[PDB]
Amino acid sequence: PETHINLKVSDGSSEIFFKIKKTTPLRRLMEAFAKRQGKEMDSLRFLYDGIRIQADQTPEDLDMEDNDIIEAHREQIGGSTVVTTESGLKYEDLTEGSGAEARAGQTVSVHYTGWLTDGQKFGSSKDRNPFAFVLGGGMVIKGWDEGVQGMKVGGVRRLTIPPQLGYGARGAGGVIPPNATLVFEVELLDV
Template identity: 50%
Template sequence: MRLVSLAVGLALLVSACGGGSASLTAPSSMPAAGSVPFSTTDLRAGSGATATTGRSIAVRYAGWLYSTTAAENKGNQFDSGTFSFVVGTGVIAGFSQGVTGMQVGGIRRVVIPPNLGYGSAGSPPQIPGNATLIFEIELLAVQ
């Protein structure tokens, strides 16, 4: 009798497992690049003058495409350098928002979603449309 019960149970188990087309996927621990929110992380606090809207500042920066698979989410680097600008003008909105409140000597990581970056147009050839960006920015001076 036990052998019959075991055989019936095994038959039910096998029939329940076959033929389906369902697939399982592992849950992603990282959001898709297009859905990452704007964020700032201070890597080093500054102690000098503060960057505010309308002030001329000098920064050193590096920019990467956001990647869910790369270390620190830094995909391909698309730019780096030093330049000056007036906070609130002349740069993408997310860059201005990212430096606002920084103090000279500080370094900040800024994650910029497409709507605060280059949007659907991108900035070819380095930055595709709808790209999320990561910048590391050091505030060098505030005028």
């Protein structure tokens, strides 16, 4: 308790915790986070109380206390924008794609992960090797048909789907509770 500190790291999708010694540089934490996510350190930016953290700073330096939150930002540099459409869907482009644009009628290929609003993962295509569907076909949940349109190949878009655009009061047997808001990260691979 005296020498070590537990810190919560949030990336807007899930939360995990890191216990390090108060005199250990935050580099150790940042690298553990990056590795766990399969991400390069150069593509991550970490903030605490709105101030940019540097890898050589320690929890002691920053007067951190147990359960304090560090924000991990993976999104493009420049400032994020969260869009709420006419339907109540929300989306956020974490990475802007450089390739072909996804349009209704195409059979598009994506990777995804889905979480509940508490950061519990409910599904993913990555956990073992890509998911293809007819975009705009009414075959997937409404949030997806609406949310994946306009993405570009290379893009990573975070969809926040209110339950009437998801599984509603029914939920999905075994997996999604009644009245659940769903968070997905979708990476567009082909169109």
